[PDB]
Amino acid sequence: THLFEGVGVALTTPFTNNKVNLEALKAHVNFLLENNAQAIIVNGTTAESPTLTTDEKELILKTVIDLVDKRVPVIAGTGTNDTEKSIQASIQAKALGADAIMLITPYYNKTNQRGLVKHFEAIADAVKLPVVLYNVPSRTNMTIEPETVEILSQHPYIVALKDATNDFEYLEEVKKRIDTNSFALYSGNDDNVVEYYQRGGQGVISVIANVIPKEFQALYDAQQSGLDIQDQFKPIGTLLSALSVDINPIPIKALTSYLGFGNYELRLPLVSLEDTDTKVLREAYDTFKAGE
Amino acid sequence: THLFEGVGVALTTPFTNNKVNLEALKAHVNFLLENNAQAIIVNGTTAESPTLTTDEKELILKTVIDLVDKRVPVIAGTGTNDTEKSIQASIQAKALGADAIMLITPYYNKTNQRGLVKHFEAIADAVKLPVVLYNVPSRTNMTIEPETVEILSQHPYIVALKDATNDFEYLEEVKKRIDTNSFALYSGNDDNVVEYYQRGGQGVISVIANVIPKEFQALYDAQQSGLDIQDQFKPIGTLLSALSVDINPIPIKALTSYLGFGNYELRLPLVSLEDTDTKVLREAYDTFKAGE
Ligand SMILES: [Cl-]
Ligand SMILES: [Cl-]
């Protein structure tokens, strides 16, 4: 059984005075649950994981696990570019009660495909918990080659790929090598979901679902029920275009804060949008909501 | 007024049974000093900094600082994609006696140009020690735009750039905006030094200088004296082509181990070359040394 199908949320971290705001975190998670999120991915890219302390990550994860209490899978981003540290974090996430972990490829150091196999298999072996691989070449400058995905999919605990390649030839090459019944493919790019779903993907791990979880999940459910969703996607597409103004999560946090979840604060080296851009983006959100 | 000119070494970390081998580290540093290295860059990309523990980094740095004892600048790689942690590491590097620190741009999270300014200035402000910026888009998928280099060069403690863009139009744009007397431009790609020196660069921070420091420094000194160094570079170019077989430092550690510094071991997620490739690269090194 897949961990989930449809829209998983790449959960943001709410800050107030550069401190994780647990009240806002809980309120945000409650909002996502109420609006049909299918999974919560915690301490990932959108959570600003590179700038969180270990104590913050563990606190956030435990808070989300306890609040969700089995309503949807809670998937802990634990992977870094250091295999040993990834092992430690993964084991601790399991101990806290995570349903799965997510492991990005290395970055900055990178590695070759043999190294990817050793890295991911070592962490999967240690944790003995479902593992979602995460491939995002735009951030890592490396990839999980389709042959490598095939090898990894045979590992008993490696069960899915968050595929942010935005490359549909890659998708087809992966599909011909894996079994979709036991190895899920989740888009890691909100922009491509219409085609990703049409081409047999299992869902998405989404940035924009932080603020429009209901509408974004409705897209998946609509196509699952046999609707065409090209027209339904259009206004979401317009909002995603507005969201492209800067590097995620700089823009999305303009919207989570707008909805009352934390202040509009990013931790260095990230920075907030300047006021004019913040206003335009919030107006785009308002326009989207008005148009429904 | 520059920390150094010519060849700085992007120092490797010698491992024996996955433990930093201090005896090999000291032997390697002594070899570099004996063979005209102009600076030693410690705990950078080539050192496998992403997989080293903080205790290991500090031990390595103190060991190098104490051994070198002011013979050449010891430049501590302390920058990460977390500004706060970069501040702590930089302050500690200063306390240990580093002459300068090196700060890569963020990666994985990345940031925008305003974020770069905040990130680098925050660390520079805290450490009050010469700072070498490090731009390597092939590992970070971001850059330090020429206008940003200009802004940063005005900071009293930001004194140089390790430029691994391999973009000579970029170099010319940077040169137009900075004062060469007070802001040094070091190549971060061994392959381009002939053109880099002739376009007015101050040197290189070098991977291949881990094993041929004397020959690589001789290029810089040769061109300094007014000689054209294109033909002199040719055999080094051939060795560099052999070194391109995999992602640094996977190949260079085949050669440092061959010279007796430490075993041929990389820490995960990196892996060693397979035996056939190890043999070919070592043969290329021997061919180069023969050929002198
Ligand atoms: Cl939030
Ligand atoms: Cl070494």
Side-chain angles (χ1 to χ4, degrees), chain A residues 1-175 177-213 215-223 225-227 229-233 235-278 280-292, chain B residues 1-213 215-278 280-292:
Chain A
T1 309
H2 295 134
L3 287 164
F4 69 98
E5 292 169 347
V7 174
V9 184
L11 186 67
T12 44
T13 301
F15 291 125
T16 301
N17 295 309
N18 198 206
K19 182 178 191 296
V20 174
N21 185 327
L22 293 180
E23 291 70 33
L25 178 65
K26 289 165 56 190
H28 193 203
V29 169
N30 272 344
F31 163 81
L32 297 174
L33 292 167
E34 169 57 19
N35 286 286
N36 308 312
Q38 301 293 302
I40 309 303
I41 287 66
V42 180
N43 297 146
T45 317
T46 302
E48 300 169 74
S49 73
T51 67
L52 299 176
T53 68
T54 296
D55 287 346
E56 286 173 326
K57 292 170 188 174
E58 292 183 6
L59 180 56
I60 291 163
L61 180 59
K62 174 43 57 165
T63 302
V64 175
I65 289 166
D66 288 352
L67 184 56
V68 171
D69 192 28
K70 304 186 171 163
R71 286 169 71 172
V72 299
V74 178
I75 303 177
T78 56
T80 71
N81 61 357
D82 176 326
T83 308
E84 190 53 41
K85 286 181 174 174
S86 300
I87 288 170
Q88 303 322 297
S90 298
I91 291 177
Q92 183 57 18
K94 182 176 186 182
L96 290 171
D99 299 291
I101 61 168
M102 184 177 67
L103 306 176
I104 192 170
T105 65
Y107 48 84
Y108 176 35
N109 52 4
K110 304 184 278 194
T111 187
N112 59 32
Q113 298 298 296
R114 287 190 298 111
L116 284 187
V117 174
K118 272 195 174 182
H119 172 83
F120 288 131
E121 287 187 354
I123 300 154
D125 286 344
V127 73
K128 299 196 303 196
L129 193 66
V131 171
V132 180
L133 304 174
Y134 174 25
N135 184 23
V136 54
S138 64
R139 298 179 179 267
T140 67
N141 261 164
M142 72 168 301
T143 195
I144 312 175
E145 299 291 356
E147 58 273 25
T148 306
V149 177
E150 185 176 13
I151 290 170
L152 291 167
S153 73
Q154 307 309 317
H155 196 284
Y157 297 108
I158 300 181
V159 307
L161 171 64
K162 180 181 174 192
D163 167 18
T165 62
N166 199 21
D167 179 346
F168 283 93
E169 178 61 25
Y170 178 86
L171 176 57
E172 290 307 323
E173 289 299 300
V174 168
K175 281 168 60 188
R177 288 174 170 76
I178 60 87
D179 186 339
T180 274
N181 296 313
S182 55
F183 191 83
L185 302 174
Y186 302 112
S187 175
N189 194 320
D190 285 331
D191 289 337
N192 72 20
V193 291
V194 175
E195 184 177 2
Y196 212 86
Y197 301 158
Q198 183 160 222
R199 291 177 174 260
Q202 279 60 65
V204 59
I205 291 172
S206 170
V207 172
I208 201 65
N210 282 104
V211 299
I212 55 154
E215 296 91 335
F216 214 56
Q217 175 60 23
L219 212 58
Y220 184 81
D221 285 328
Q223 68 82 35
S225 75
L227 304 186
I229 54 164
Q230 283 85 351
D231 287 354
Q232 195 174 333
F233 178 81
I236 294 169
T238 299
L239 181 54
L240 291 167
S241 291
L243 198 77
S244 75
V245 62
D246 214 330
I247 298 157
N248 175 62
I250 291 175
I252 194 61
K253 298 197 84 191
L255 301 183
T256 54
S257 58
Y258 194 46
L259 275 56
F261 307 121
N263 292 336
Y264 186 23
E265 188 188 356
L266 283 294
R267 189 172 280 175
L268 284 170
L270 297 176
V271 292
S272 61
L273 292 170
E274 294 177 321
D275 288 353
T276 48
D277 290 333
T278 302
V280 169
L281 179 52
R282 291 171 172 186
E283 286 170 342
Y285 170 85
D286 288 334
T287 296
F288 171 77
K289 297 297 290 198
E292 309 186 68
Chain B
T1 176
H2 309 133
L3 289 163
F4 70 98
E5 289 176 355
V7 174
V9 184
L11 185 69
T12 44
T13 303
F15 292 123
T16 302
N17 296 129
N18 202 26
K19 179 178 191 291
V20 172
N21 185 328
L22 293 179
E23 293 67 35
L25 178 67
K26 290 163 63 192
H28 191 204
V29 170
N30 274 343
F31 165 83
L32 297 171
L33 292 167
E34 174 54 21
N35 287 287
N36 303 326
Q38 301 295 301
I40 303 178
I41 290 67
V42 183
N43 294 328
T45 315
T46 302
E48 300 172 72
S49 72
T51 67
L52 295 177
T53 68
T54 298
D55 286 347
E56 283 170 332
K57 295 169 191 173
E58 291 178 8
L59 176 62
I60 289 164
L61 179 58
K62 181 87 286 211
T63 302
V64 177
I65 289 167
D66 292 348
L67 182 57
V68 171
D69 194 27
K70 306 300 299 187
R71 288 172 69 172
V72 300
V74 178
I75 303 182
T78 57
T80 71
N81 62 357
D82 178 322
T83 307
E84 190 51 51
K85 286 182 170 172
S86 298
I87 290 169
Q88 304 322 304
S90 299
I91 290 173
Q92 182 56 19
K94 185 183 190 175
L96 292 168
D99 299 289
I101 62 169
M102 186 167 75
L103 301 176
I104 193 164
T105 66
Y107 47 83
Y108 175 34
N109 52 2
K110 303 181 274 195
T111 187
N112 61 30
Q113 298 298 298
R114 293 189 295 110
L116 285 187
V117 172
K118 274 196 167 182
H119 173 83
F120 287 130
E121 290 183 354
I123 300 158
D125 285 347
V127 75
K128 297 169 69 177
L129 194 66
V131 170
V132 182
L133 304 172
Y134 176 24
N135 186 26
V136 53
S138 67
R139 297 180 179 266
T140 68
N141 256 156
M142 69 170 301
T143 193
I144 311 175
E145 294 291 353
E147 59 273 20
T148 308
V149 178
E150 187 179 4
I151 289 164
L152 293 170
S153 75
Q154 306 300 302
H155 196 285
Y157 298 108
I158 301 180
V159 306
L161 172 66
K162 181 182 173 189
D163 168 18
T165 62
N166 213 20
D167 181 342
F168 285 99
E169 287 69 59
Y170 171 89
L171 180 59
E172 294 304 330
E173 292 302 323
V174 167
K175 280 164 63 187
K176 290 173 193 158
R177 288 172 184 270
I178 62 92
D179 185 341
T180 189
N181 301 132
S182 55
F183 193 84
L185 300 173
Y186 302 116
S187 175
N189 188 334
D190 287 331
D191 298 342
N192 75 17
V193 295
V194 174
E195 186 170 1
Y196 210 90
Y197 299 160
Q198 110 163 135
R199 296 292 195 89
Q202 282 57 68
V204 60
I205 292 169
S206 172
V207 171
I208 201 67
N210 281 103
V211 302
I212 54 156
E215 294 91 338
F216 212 53
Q217 176 58 27
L219 282 173
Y220 182 77
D221 286 331
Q223 70 75 42
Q224 242 205 144
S225 80
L227 301 170
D228 187 312
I229 52 159
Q230 187 166 10
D231 296 343
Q232 188 172 343
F233 177 85
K234 282 177 174 168
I236 294 170
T238 298
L239 179 55
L240 287 171
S241 292
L243 194 78
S244 73
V245 61
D246 214 328
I247 301 153
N248 172 246
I250 293 173
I252 192 64
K253 297 198 85 186
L255 300 184
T256 53
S257 59
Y258 192 42
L259 271 60
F261 311 122
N263 289 340
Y264 187 24
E265 189 184 355
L266 285 289
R267 191 171 279 174
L268 285 167
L270 295 180
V271 294
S272 59
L273 293 169
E274 308 218 49
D275 287 353
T276 294
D277 290 341
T278 301
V280 170
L281 177 54
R282 288 174 172 179
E283 286 171 336
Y285 168 83
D286 288 331
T287 294
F288 173 75
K289 299 294 294 192
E292 309 185 71

